[PDB]
Amino acid sequence: DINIDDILAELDKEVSPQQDFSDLMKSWKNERCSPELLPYPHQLMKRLLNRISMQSQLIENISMGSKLPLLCMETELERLKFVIRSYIRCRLSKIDKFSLYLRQLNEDENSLISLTDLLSKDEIKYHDTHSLIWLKLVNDSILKYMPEELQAINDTEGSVNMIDEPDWNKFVFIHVNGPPDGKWNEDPLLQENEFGKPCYTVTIPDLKEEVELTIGSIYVMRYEVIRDLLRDDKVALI
């Protein structure tokens, strides 16, 4: 019999502050779990901080001018500020642990990414000056007494490597979202399993093995194996 659902669809059809907070929640949750330091959202933070300032002035103006709407506005601003506070504290904690690694990544002239791409201006200031403070402390206290072959602080060639770096093979929990627009027919990686949902396929190279990541199922997976799909928002960390 004659289908018309498409005829009805074509007949029938004839950035926001809400979205930014969802992106902030996404960034916060991903930053907490992942082993590496993810790149800073430069644009989002500018817009959010401006909005916070304007809302604060509006609350003051209305206060100086029913109680309940003011209660909602005040506690909403508290809820918004808490997330940003937690997020920035986590990022600074990551910068403490990978300071020499980030410095070495910056000193490499052939690096595919610059340190200013990855970090915010405040983070750059913190990294630079904190490294000098720590360096001065150990340089005078310990290294002043060592012979010239052992006076380097970031030595790679010694019997133990003095530089730490992320564990790229850490296990993480994931939830498979698919492409964000619902465009299952457009995603080139998204093949299909038999009589069911679409899926992605990944190769785990130490073992020479494959797995199928169906939409909507949860997995415990190595970080490096799923890094690209995470960067493309095909999956989200639980």
Partner 1 sequence: FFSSYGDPCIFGSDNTLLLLSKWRSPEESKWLPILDSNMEIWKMSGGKETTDIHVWPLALAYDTLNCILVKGKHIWPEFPLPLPSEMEIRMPVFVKSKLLEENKEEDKEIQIPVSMAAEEEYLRSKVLSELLTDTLENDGEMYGNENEVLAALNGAYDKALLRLFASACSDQNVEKALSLAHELKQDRALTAAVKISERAELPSLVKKINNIREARYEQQLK
Partner 2 sequence: SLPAHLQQTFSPEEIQFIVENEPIKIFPRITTRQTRWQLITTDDKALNNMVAMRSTEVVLWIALLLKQQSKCSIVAPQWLTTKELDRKIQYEKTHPDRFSELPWNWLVLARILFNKAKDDFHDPIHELRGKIQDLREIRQIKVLKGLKYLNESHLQLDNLSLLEINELRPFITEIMDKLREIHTASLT
One of 96, 117, 122, 128 touching partner 2 (CB under 8 A)? 96
In terms of CB distance, is 38 or 80 closer to partner 2? 80
Binding status of residue 14 toward partner 1 by CB under 8 A? yes
φ and ψ at residue 176, rounded to 5 degrees? -90, 115
Token pair 């916060």 in the structure block, residue: 28
Interacting stretch for partner 1, rule CB under 8 A, among 11-19, 45-53, 88-96, 217-225?
11-19
CA dihedral 163→169→173→174, nearest 10 degrees, is 110
> Which residues make beta-bridge pairs with 211?
202
Residue 7 interacting partner from partner 2, partner 1, none (CB closer than 5 to 8 Å by kind): partner 1
CA dihedral 36→42→48→53, nearest 10 degrees, is 120
Are the C-beta atoms of residues 234 and 178 closer than 8 Å to each other?
A: yes
Interface pattern 1-30 for partner 2 (x via CB under 8 A): ----------------xx--x---x-----
Binding status of residue 208 toward partner 2 by CB under 8 A? no
Q: What SS3 class is residue 139? A: helix
Written as one string, the DSSP assignment of 24-83 is HHHHHHHHHH-SS-PPP-HHHHHHHHHHHHHHHHHHHHHHH---HHHHHHHHHHHHHHHH
Binding status of residue 33 toward partner 2 by CB under 8 A? yes
Q: Give the span between the Cα atoms of 85 and 161, in whole angstroms.
A: 34
- In whole angstroms, the minimum distance from the beta carbon of 5 to partner 1 comes to 9
In terms of CB distance, is 2 or 220 closer to partner 1? 2
Report 105-144 residues binding partner 2 (CB under 8 A): none
Q: Give the span between the Cα atoms of 154 and 44, in whole angstroms.
A: 35
Binding status of residue 64 toward partner 2 by CB under 8 A? no
Report 55-94 residues binding partner 1 (CB under 8 A): none
Residue ranges that bind partner 2, judged by CB under 8 A: 17-18, 21, 25, 32-33, 51, 55, 58, 62, 66, 68-69, 71-73, 75-77, 79-80, 89-90, 92-93, 96, 169-173, 204, 206-207, 209, 211, 217-222, 238
Binding site for partner 1 (CB under 8 A): 1-4, 7-8, 11-12, 14
